[PDB]
């Protein structure tokens, strides 16, 4: 039709009027049967039987120094700088990793070296504030910094936590296998 005004098709729907709630006498079960569930605690022993059933089933936990949970190829943990085949540092200072690290953990100075190609003089992550965006991985055209899926690198000093170029190239030396394995499952989906 025409509505009133203050009046959409949002009327109250069909049967929105809730039933008048049942009293003591509009109840199908006997008072004795109801109070059997009252005193003898039916829904108490019911959940007690539930947790007893869970006693006789398997746990889930793993022996962590002996078993490890699931690790995706696109998992991220600490960093590393890859190298080329025949071993060349692979990082040019495009500064994209400095440009889009939203905590500004990246700090780079870089100079033209002897042969004339550009290489990085100082590459430095502040791992206090590396926030695991992983955007720094997605920002390298030449694919130099990556996300090594290590997380077990817990330090005892803040001094240990400033990864310069040398620690990251050592990590790129170390984890080179796994970074090859991960990019063999991610480089399509990048």
């Amino acid at each position: 039709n025409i509505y009133a005004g203050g009046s959409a098709a949002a009327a109250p729907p069909a049967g929105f009027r809730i039933h008048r709630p049942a009293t003591w006498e509009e109840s199908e079960e006997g008072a004795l049967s109801k109070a059997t569930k009252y005193f003898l605690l039916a829904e108490m022993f019911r959940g007690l039987y539930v947790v007893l059933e869970q006693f006789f089933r398997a746990p889930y936990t793993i022996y962590y120094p002996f078993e490890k949970g699931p690790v995706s190829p696109r998992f991220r943990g600490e960093h590393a700088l890859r190298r080329y085949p025949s071993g060349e540092e692979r990082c040019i200072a495009c500064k994209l990793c400095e440009a889009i690290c939203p905590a500004l953990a990246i700090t780079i100075d870089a100079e033209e070296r002897i042969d004339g190609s550009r290489r990085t003089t100082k590459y430095d992550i502040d791992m206090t504030k590396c926030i695991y965006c992983g955007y720094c991985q997605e920002s390298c055209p030449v694919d130099a910094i990556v996300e090594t899926p290590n997380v077990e690198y817990a330090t005892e000093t803040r001094e240990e936590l400033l990864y310069n170029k040398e620690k990251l190239l050592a990590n790129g030396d170390k984890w080179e296998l796994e970074l090859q394995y991960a990019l063999d499952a991610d480089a399509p989906y990048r």
Partner: protein, 181 residues
């Protein structure tokens, strides 16, 4: 009823053996219950680091998008075709009343129509003066509705409501929550 109870051989769970299965059918609340462990040679095999489907994977794309020959960018542009923020003064609504509309203008004499425009565009009249000036048909055409009713606060897509109540409901009666949709 299309999503009701299904038996436990279609649930992808570690299950049981067979005399202990015959035990636990007699000892459970419902027999069709998963113990929560996924099946080891099915769940997460092969590992995501080694997927044979991942070997050939170029790009997902759509046909009017990836069409190299036919489209330019500016036809499929979307950032530079944004609508402008339509702003309205108090004064331009008085312009909408007396000068009229592009649907139904009230202005001939296009030379002096600019002069009749411009003092109102400079503030010759007031809004309540225009309201007294506006006719009953003017108010009931471009301010109120054709019955002279106030416009309902309008909505994007009005969603009428059902109330599912019976055995298709997610709770039977006694439980206070209903399941409208």
């Amino acid at each position: 009823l299309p999503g009701g109870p299904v038996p436990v051989f279609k649930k992808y769970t570690v299950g049981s053996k067979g005399i202990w299965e015959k035990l636990r059918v007699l000892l459970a609340i419902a027999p069709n219950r998963s113990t929560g462990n996924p099946i080891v040679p099915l769940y997460r095999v092969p590992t995501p680091g080694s997927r044979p489907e991942a070997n050939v994977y170029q790009d997902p794309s759509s046909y009017p998008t990836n069409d190299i020959a036919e489209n330019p960018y500016w036809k499929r542009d979307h950032r530079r075709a944004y609508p402008q923020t339509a702003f309205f003064d108090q004064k331009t609504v008085t312009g909408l009343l007396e000068l009229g509309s592009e649907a139904t203008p009230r202005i001939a004499d296009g030379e002096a129509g600019t002069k009749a425009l411009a003092n109102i565009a400079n503030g010759g009249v007031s809004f309540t003066q225009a309201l007294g000036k506006s006719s009953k048909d003017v108010i009931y055409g471009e301010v109120l509705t054709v019955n002279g009713l106030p416009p309902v606060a309008p909505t994007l897509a009005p969603k009428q409501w059902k109330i599912i109540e019976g055995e298709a409901a997610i709770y039977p009666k006694g439980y206070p929550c209903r399941t409208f949709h």
